[PDB]
C-alpha cells in the first residue's frame, strides 16, 4: 500500500464486462459515474492502481 503501482491503459477498447465475474457478488462500488453505463460513454485516459 505504501508503494503502490501505476499503469497507463491507453489505445485500446475496454471490456468492463469481464470484471463482474470476479468475487461472489462483488465489492464493486463506483463513485462519480453510473457503474452500468460506462461502456457506451468515451473517455480520454484510464489510470489504474493496485
Residue 10 CB-half CA count within 13 A: 6
Residues 35 and 48: their CA atoms lie apart, in Å, by 16
Residues 19-48 that bind another protein (CB under 8 A): 32, 34-37
Count, residues near another protein per rule CB under 8 A = 5
Q: Which is nearer to another protein, 40 or 49 (CB)?
A: 40
The Cβ of residue 38 has, within 10 Å, a number of other Cβ atoms equal to 13
Q: Which is nearer to another protein, 35 or 46 (CB)?
A: 35
Q: Which is nearer to another protein, 36 or 44 (CB)?
A: 36
Amino acid at each position: 500500500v505504501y508503494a503502490w503501482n501505476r499503469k497507463r491503459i491507453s489505445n485500446c477498447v475496454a471490456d468492463y464486462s469481464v470484471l463482474y465475474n470476479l468475487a461472489p457478488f462483488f465489492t464493486f462500488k463506483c463513485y462519480g459515474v453510473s457503474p452500468t453505463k460506462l461502456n457506451d460513454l468515451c473517455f480520454t485516459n484510464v489510470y489504474a492502481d493496485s
